[PDB]
Design a protein around this nucleic acid. Structure first.
Ligand SMILES: [Mg+2]
Ligand SMILES: [Mg+2]
Ligand SMILES: [Mg+2]
Length: 65
RNA sequence: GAUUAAUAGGGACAGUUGGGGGCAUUAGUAUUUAAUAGUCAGAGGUGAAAUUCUUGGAUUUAUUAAGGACUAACUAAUGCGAAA
């Protein structure tokens, strides 16, 4: 089934807190989650990942995706 | 036998005032770099782009450290200095 290598013991009440470092440049955008320490990185997405055009790198469409 | 004592000037003294100067000290993020951890495929830059950087892992994230600069914001029809 689903083996989520995330945290062992949760509940529906519980909050699981990640931290999102977001960098916005006129030339791009970065959405980066880590733990509360900032050490261990979970997810990484840049605008340029989501579009092939150099100019669209920053744009809201890209940021959304 | 020595004119006043200039809202003339020099000097003394008293509480201040100042981003004036010279030495020492000392901080602060920031840029750049390095280290140690992470994670991955793109970062940069532009009107678009291309030179660049990138899997030898960049950009990115956390913690330190090195090294030169620089004193933000408060900061003003405010201050000081002969001007710079
Ligand atoms: Mg330092
Ligand atoms: Mg220093
Ligand atoms: Mg003043």
């Amino acid at each position: 089934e689903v083996i989520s290598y995330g945290p062992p013991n949760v509940g529906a009440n519980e909050n699981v807190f990640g931290v999102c470092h977001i960098m916005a440049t006129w030339n791009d955008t970065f959405i980066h989650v880590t733990d509360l320490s900032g050490r261990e990185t979970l997810v990484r997405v840049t605008g340029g990942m989501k579009v092939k055009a150099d100019r669209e790198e920053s744009s809201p469409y890209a940021a959304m995706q």
